[PDB]
Design a protein around this ligand. Sequence first.
Ligand SMILES: CCOc1nc2cccc(C(=O)OCc3oc(=O)oc3C)c2n1Cc1ccc(-c2ccccc2-c2noc(=O)[nH]2)cc1
Ligand SMILES: CCOc1nc2cccc(C(=O)OCc3oc(=O)oc3C)c2n1Cc1ccc(-c2ccccc2-c2noc(=O)[nH]2)cc1
Ligand SMILES: [Ca+2]
Ligand SMILES: [Ca+2]
Ligand SMILES: [Ca+2]
Ligand SMILES: [Ca+2]
Ligand SMILES: [Ca+2]
Ligand SMILES: [Ca+2]
Lengths: 168, 168
Amino acid sequence: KLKPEVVEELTRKTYFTEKEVQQWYKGFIKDCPSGQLDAAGFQKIYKQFFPFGDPTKFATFVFNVFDENKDGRIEFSEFIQALSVTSRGTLDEKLRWAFKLYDLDNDGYITRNEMLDIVDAIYQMVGNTVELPEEENTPEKRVDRIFAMMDKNADGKLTLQEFQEGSK
Amino acid sequence: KLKPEVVEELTRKTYFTEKEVQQWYKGFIKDCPSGQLDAAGFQKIYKQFFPFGDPTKFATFVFNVFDENKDGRIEFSEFIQALSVTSRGTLDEKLRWAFKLYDLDNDGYITRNEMLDIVDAIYQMVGNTVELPEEENTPEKRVDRIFAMMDKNADGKLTLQEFQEGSK
Ligand SMILES: CCOc1nc2cccc(C(=O)OCc3oc(=O)oc3C)c2n1Cc1ccc(-c2ccccc2-c2noc(=O)[nH]2)cc1
Ligand SMILES: CCOc1nc2cccc(C(=O)OCc3oc(=O)oc3C)c2n1Cc1ccc(-c2ccccc2-c2noc(=O)[nH]2)cc1
Ligand SMILES: [Ca+2]
Ligand SMILES: [Ca+2]
Ligand SMILES: [Ca+2]
Ligand SMILES: [Ca+2]
Ligand SMILES: [Ca+2]
Ligand SMILES: [Ca+2]
């Protein structure tokens, strides 16, 4: 369990109610009994959500942001804060969190290569399971959308009139 | 050369002037000395424009439309008429020509498979040389467009302010 002074300060510094902080601390200790989470465990957790990808790179980048004090461990105070900002923060706070994710070397700037590395990390993890933007208009999907819209009577055939009217 | 009665009727039945009909007849005989064009030559011509693709399927489908009387040859009267409609016809005429291309078995209807076959024929011919719709928003292009738009001072780096303002 969590001391009452700790629950009061954490509730104060985050967007969660006291009950929700205590429910998050339970889940933290359940899937992290030592009370401390290192990069290896972070990666293994992301591997449960994405078994068919390589979550190494992206998990490492996200671990960099969770680890506020950059000591190699994620204590609960860092765990809850990241969740509070990423899930219930203002747009400016979420964007600051995102800037930090994209700023891999933590020098205060995002380079083209850093941004490319993030997208490559995301693709390595989810590329082969989630629908991607470049797959929205593949040739077969284009044909299916045109033909469905032109086939007004849905008989599976296109008359010239359907083809002409549908072409406009 | 072309008889004056032939040039008068062809000019009448097409959108070309007499001089243009005679210039098209010259080009026809130059790249088709026998005065008759069969499927093999049609395919070989399309192969000159697309050496790295397989223009067989698409050339065959287009030859089907050129060959109005479906006798296996493209005479000049068919050659000039196809060009006149495809290049200078009304929208309704161009669409009728296109419907005929897409109607592979010439039964008056376009099925899903017929439309898919046309797109597959086009891809076999130009797929590996022309830019495709599904390639417009690939991950690298998305990154380049976001980063270029967010990098206002074009120094190659993104400050938090640039990232925030550009995110909106
Ligand atoms: C919908 C409910 O889950 C969420 N709500 C979120 C709100 C915002 C962000 C994230 C998110 O993705 O943060 C990044 C992230 O991703 C990832 O996989 O791990 C982490 C840390 C959220 N997650 C997903 C999540 C996954 C795992 C844990 C976790 C990690 C270590 C130890 C215990 C737990 C745990 N404690 O209680 C549990 O149920 N597990 C926590 C949260
Ligand atoms: C910009 C100038 O070319 C065009 N203007 C067009 C207007 C509308 C459509 C087409 C088009 O693509 O028709 C389908 C098509 O495609 C293809 O490759 O062959 C064909 C027949 C056009 N073409 C391209 C073209 C290519 C080859 C020939 C051709 C074929 C056989 C014998 C002689 C010639 C010839 N006679 O004079 C020449 O210069 N060549 C004719 C035209
Ligand atoms: Ca830490
Ligand atoms: Ca950086
Ligand atoms: Ca129909
Ligand atoms: Ca013919
Ligand atoms: Ca048909
Ligand atoms: Ca800049």
